[PDB]
Design a protein around this ligand. Structure first.
Ligand code: ROV
Ligand code: ROV
Ligand code: ROV
Ligand code: ROV
Ligand code: CLR
Ligand code: CLR
Ligand code: CLR
Ligand code: CLR
Ligand code: CLR
Ligand code: CLR
Ligand code: CLR
Ligand code: CLR
Ligand code: OLA
Ligand code: OLA
Ligand code: OLA
Ligand code: OLA
Lengths: 375, 375, 375, 375
């Protein structure tokens, strides 16, 4: 079974009309308004824009080095498949493409001493492009093996908010530019909220790790003190980059099928949590690793087939982190596995939320430790 | 217009069945589970039961001095009205009743050096009894002025969750003891949550006010650091003593009409906020001060009639606080007035939530300052 | 034969209407009025409230340590039987319940140096709860043994004036609050009468036991001098705690079947005296020891079966006394046995009344001796 | 209206069959049995027969000097009226009769130093004989005044339990000698009970009045200590000499109309108390002073007519007391008047019983004081 596309609307959006959720939304904006008034009134007697100006250090060079990678992932796979579907040298071309964005974004990352944010831009873009380039390839190839995909659909697909290539993509009548303006305003608001959290309740508690004799009193209490930044960081990532950002693009491109996330907050079974969190990357990983592993192995036993998807999911995130902050030690590999093992096999809903709270409380602390032990 | 009673169910209860709210409920229990695991794991290498054992110092003497006050407010008003409705000395008896719980709970509060919690018990009980005793009198008196209320209904009314005396009180078929057991379990859970907040994120930041040279750096930043304890304290008071506790008693006594609070979190207009927060005391204050002021004055201009209710509401809360922690300075009088003036006259919803957040952030800080400057 | 309940009225109550008994009742109130006028006129040139304030020393702590015992005996037996009737761990829970009010009321009695009155409160409450908790268990268990009792009926039963659990309890139309007010007024009057007796005709004769060379002149004459306090103490216990108090609760709870005592004062045979004095505890002891001993033993000879009930009745009262005044020596064990042996086997009515008069004359004297030899 | 005689039975006798009163009766016999066992067991290591042997000092001379007085009151009035009803010297004879028992029982009382008991015998006999001799005279005389009573009826009347002379006296079929034997057994039992009270709870507390500095501490407390002997003395006088003794004679003489006392213990109004206590002397006093005062004065105003009966009643009792113990000071004149004034003019039932209790408590104390201040 390969995914078939329908015209359902993003669950939170149709839910965002129910009044009590507009209240919760307003309560969180009040929370932002409290941080901005208090930080203003304190630092007046300027702001924590220290992070934004620092973190976005070489953002010009980041975007100027994004451009050629985008041009390469645009041209290379299409030309490769087009000549290859005329019966050549494509085998070398797509491999050269696989290299041009496997070395370039690492070279430009390390050799030019990039800050974290403008590093995370390029690393996300390289995984993104690898995923959807390969997706298009594995879709188009079986069509060629009889004893030409439309270019416009490909270029469209490269900006479409989904990683599955269908060259159908059932669309909406028109574009509510008021709605996309609101969505990007909220996305920027979310970035400012995350900036305030990392500037105020994350750094000041963790700046002073130079005064640590390997005691467990400034690690456990610090982890608990940092669990709330942790949960806000994760939940803001969710809202900003899965309901603000992807819905904004799903609007601009007239893209239907806006189910990027089903109710993950309701997930009783942990399988349901994997199923209904970030459904776009889940759909790619499911279609192109699980349902291809099952075919390649021909395995009745998914036991080895799955834990393949989990292993790829585990290395991808550690690669990203290890890349973004230049840290050789994986924590979220070991934490990913130990949380996997706990929630997978070992009102149940509470345990997931608890093991998610510390699931963040650990991530932030153990990183802000070595982000300063390296500085 | 005097209030008429109907068999509607408490809004949050019928809302508590909708699944996303069961999620939020579970998220908050996860929060509690994180505090208990972390406090256990820290203080093992015992608990903050320091507060519970301290705050409930003479709780025995508190309940044993509650008993006679309850016996007096039970007997005195009924006997007085009963002989007074036989044509006597009642005028002296009700005045003696008005004294016996105006002096006794102050005497036993000050002259025995009571802690805060077992002080707040008696002060709530004395205001409670004054309010509903007077309520019964002003209901039954006009019935007597023709040129006898059933006693069982009075003793019932004295325990009924509403402050209006109707001696009808439309009732429910039977008693779901599973539901009341759940409600009291949640109420105790709420007290443990509040204990953890006051023991962990309120006291440790505020213990060190002995090292203050009248700087505004350890007042403003401390107020913002204490805004979140503030909001949790208020919102736990709401859930514990308006949906856990009063619904539990509204169940045990087969009492219908469980509308103690309409959607206050939705209140756009501030008048609506006063209308739909703690509807029981609002209903008493409305019926017996506003609609009686309007009658006494005969005033077309409510301008003096209202600001009477607000003034009584303002002195009552300051009396409680000033009593409970033995503090002569009113803050929430001046704060009550300055917040009144701001939200009353000066998407709007956000401003209320913001001016509520600091509305708490101020109360806690300015008190935990003088609770230690006196100790 | 297990007891079946009927709607008969308490014999003394229906007798209290016959005019000559209203005379005797008035004669005894005259007696009280003589003590109050004379004590007032003497001690003016204040009262014997010395005993009431002393005896009720830590009455606050007594009621606050009563509360958890009541909560435990409410919850534990029901929850245990309920899960045990779902096919568990109940066997441990009821044993933990059997401990929580076997140690707690002894600990709080001895380790806090309680006075006699506020000791007798808790010791009565622990025996009371043990008796009716066990009663409920042994009633409900045989219902479960087929190859759920209503909770409301259990909590009701826990306050019902009878120790047999029936969950039927045939009830009266309504509640004569005038009658219950009268009953509690009489009960308080009885306590004041008993206070006056112990303060005037018991202590002043017995304070001077420091001047005793083991002579029989200040023991026998003192015993006779103290026989009348003795009879008034017993007969006031009868009227206060079997016709004032239990009828007041049998009224408040709409409980029918108010036969707590048949005409004991008429008892010719001593078996009839055991049968018709304090019929509630007699009914429990009969149903759950005699009629269960007969079943367990399968004994045609009740000779060992009875003297079981008598032995339990003998140890229970000595346990109470030994507990209440902290006296290791049993007298009313030996006196209970010697009076048993005399009236059981060895116009006849007179001998019982005589052997009751000294039956009291002994108890008081032999106690007020060692209550001061220990002080 | 002069009294007319009917065949009603003594109220307590027909009441003595109702079972609860047989219980009270047995309770009082138990009380006697306790005094006899305890006095025996004490004085063994003989009895208080000291009083009986002392008080009945010259009882032989008392009876031998009773005889001639009886012979005189028998013969003199009959012979006087018989000759006087033959048309003489009768006017001198009845006057000589009035002297022969007005001087003789005083002479033999004082000049021979008689003890109290054997004095009270003769003083009762002289008032008794005066009353019924005069009664017969005032009955028979109006029959003679037309322009002979049967002797046997007179001699009978002189022993009849009533003071009104009717020479009809409606009689009963026969004589239940079992019943009269029981009555005299009870009468002797009552004398033994009174002896025990005066020997044990009256004298030992009052022997030590030689050690009094005119303090009010050994007068008020002693009066209260002696109120219970007081009430038993009065109530035993009632039972012994109005239900044991007069009913025994009302049996032996086949006399109907045994209403010597209606329910005095029920008397709400004090007029009812005078009406229904000792109805025999009341009937004489009513018939021969009140209904003759009203005739002599012809007074519409009974105000002076009554207070005549009260004055005669007041002097008669003080004469008796003053005679019996040789005490010149009247207390029960002043107490009679002060109790008269209080209960006559100034659930009401209680006050009478209270003012009776002290009404005795005073009498005994104030006498046992001067019975020893004279000895
Ligand atoms: C949030 C994470 C623990 C998680 C839980 C369950 C399932 C998944 C995948 C297989 C869909 C993920 N990982 C993810 O979605 N990674 C991609 C993104 C991501 C989210 C959070 C994090 N952090 C934990 C910082 C990193 C990447 C989504 C939004 C931005 C990219
Ligand atoms: C919460 C408060 C600012 C407020 C806002 C709007 C309207 C009212 C009244 C007129 C109903 C109140 N005050 C109140 O309800 N006082 C009584 C109680 C109360 C609530 C909070 C506080 N604190 C602010 C600690 C004190 C009392 C309700 C729950 C317990 C008693
Ligand atoms: C009064 C006692 C000697 C007695 C005689 C005959 C039968 C019984 C029982 C088996 C019903 C008792 N004991 C009793 O009833 N104990 C319980 C109570 C009791 C009564 C008197 C005493 N005292 C002798 C002080 C102690 C307990 C009843 C009222 C208060 C509790
Ligand atoms: C008992 C007395 C206070 C009293 C109250 C009310 C009415 C009367 C009369 C008018 C019938 C009397 N007095 C009386 O009855 N005197 C005669 C007797 C009497 C009774 C008691 C006393 N004492 C007070 C010792 C003296 C005489 C009756 C039984 C023996 C003679
Ligand atoms: C606009 C700026 C201030 C960011 C606002 C973020 C808020 C409005 C968004 C981001 C994540 C969202 C939450 C994530 C999921 C849940 C759990 C659900 O059971 C209740 C709604 C709730 C709690 C959502 C409410 C709206 C939400 C809180
Ligand atoms: C709070 C501080 C650290 C600001 C954080 C800035 C970074 C972490 C945030 C802000 C804007 C975000 C980016 C905006 C949108 C995109 C395009 C998408 O195709 C890849 C992810 C990427 C590149 C996001 C990654 C995370 C991001 C770069
Ligand atoms: C049981 C213990 C842990 C206390 C739990 C308190 C939680 C479950 C209760 C107390 C107060 C309640 C909240 C108060 C009002 C709102 C605003 C509304 O727009 C969304 C629901 C929400 C957010 C409620 C959800 C449930 C709630 C959070
Ligand atoms: C967190 C720490 C300080 C514990 C706080 C304990 C106090 C503040 C809480 C816990 C239980 C609460 C009480 C329980 C219920 C009642 C009965 C009601 O008729 C008056 C209010 C009153 C008396 C509550 C007042 C507030 C209260 C006393
Ligand atoms: C109200 C205060 C003063 C206490 C009064 C106690 C009196 C009124 C009560 C308590 C015990 C009762 C007594 C106990 C039993 C008997 C024996 C019976 O054969 C006659 C009634 C009699 C004598 C009762 C009469 C009423 C009584 C005496
Ligand atoms: C005369 C002086 C000593 C006063 C005596 C006070 C004591 C002995 C009396 C007064 C009130 C009585 C208590 C009131 C009612 C109850 C509740 C019942 O479920 C158990 C017995 C118990 C607890 C009684 C026991 C005896 C008691 C405690
Ligand atoms: C035979 C010896 C022991 C003397 C016995 C005296 C007793 C049995 C007699 C003498 C006086 C009598 C009492 C006097 C009047 C009353 C008041 C009445 O409302 C109840 C009966 C009662 C209480 C009588 C009961 C029997 C009585 C007590
Ligand atoms: C307790 C001690 C003092 C014994 C008292 C003995 C005296 C007071 C008692 C015992 C027997 C009684 C007497 C027996 C019967 C009679 C005959 C009657 O026609 C006159 C009264 C009279 C004479 C009684 C008067 C009181 C009396 C004399
Ligand atoms: C597993 C690692 C996470 C990789 C993140 C993938 C994000 C989802 C992928 C594609 C949808 C994004 C489409 C809209 C972004 C266009 C912005 C741009 O090109 O600058
Ligand atoms: C304005 C000051 C706030 C006063 C608080 C009043 C609370 C609401 C009043 C009555 C409803 C309470 C009924 C249930 C409580 C019974 C508990 C008890 O009696 O101990
Ligand atoms: C044998 C030892 C005597 C034990 C005494 C037992 C008393 C009779 C038992 C139960 C009936 C009492 C019911 C009314 C009391 C409720 C008062 C309360 O709970 O405080
Ligand atoms: C007012 C002073 C009291 C006087 C007492 C009078 C007693 C009642 C009078 C007469 C009835 C007595 C009849 C039986 C007694 C005969 C005994 C005898 O003669 O020895």
């Amino acid at each position: 079974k390969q995914k078939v596309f329908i015209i359902r609307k993003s669950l939170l959006d149709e839910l965002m009309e129910v009044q009590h959720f507009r209240t919760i939304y307003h309560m969180f904006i009040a929370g932002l308004c409290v941080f901005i008034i208090s930080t203003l009134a304190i630092d007046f007697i300027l702001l924590e824009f220290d992070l934004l100006i620092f973190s976005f250090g070489q953002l010009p060079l980041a975007l100027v080095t994004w451009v050629p990678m985008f041009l390469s992932t645009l041209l290379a796979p299409y030309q490769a498949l087009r000549l290859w579907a005329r019966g050549g040298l494509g085998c070398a071309l797509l491999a050269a493409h696989a290299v041009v964005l496997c070395a370039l974004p690492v070279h430009v990352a390390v050799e030019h001493q990039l800050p974290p944010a403008s590093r995370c831009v390029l690393v996300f873009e390289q995984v993104r492009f690898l995923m959807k380039s390969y997706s298009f390839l594995r879709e188009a190839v079986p069509g060629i093996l009889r004893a030409a995909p439309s270019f416009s659909s490909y270029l469209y697909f490269l900006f479409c908010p989904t990683l599955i290539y269908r060259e159908t993509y059932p669309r909406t009548p028109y574009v509510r530019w008021n709605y996309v303006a609101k969505n990007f305003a909220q996305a920027l608001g979310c970035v400012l909220y995350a900036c305030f959290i990392l500037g105020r309740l994350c750094v000041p508690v963790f700046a002073n790790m130079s005064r640590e004799p390997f005691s467990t009193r400034a690690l456990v209490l610090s982890i608990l003190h940092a669990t709330l930044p942790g949960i806000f960081m994760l939940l803001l990532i969710f809202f900003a980059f899965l309901h603000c950002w992807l819905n904004a693009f799903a609007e601009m491109l007239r893209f239907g099928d806006r189910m990027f996330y089903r109710d993950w907050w309701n997930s009783t079974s942990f399988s349901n949590y994997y199923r209904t969190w970030n459904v776009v990357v889940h759909d790619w990983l499911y279609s192109y690793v699980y349902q291809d592993g099952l075919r390649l192995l021909g395995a009745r036993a998914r036991g080895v087939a799955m834990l393949g998807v989990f292993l790829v999911s585990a290395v991808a995130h550690e690669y990203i982190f290890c890349f973004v902050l230049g840290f050789f030690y994986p924590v979220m590999l070991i934490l990913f596995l130990v949380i996997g093992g706990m929630l997978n096999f070992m009102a149940w809903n509470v345990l997931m939320w608890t093991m998610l709270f510390l699931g963040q409380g650990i991530q932030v602390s153990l990183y802000c430790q070595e982000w300063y032990a390296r500085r």
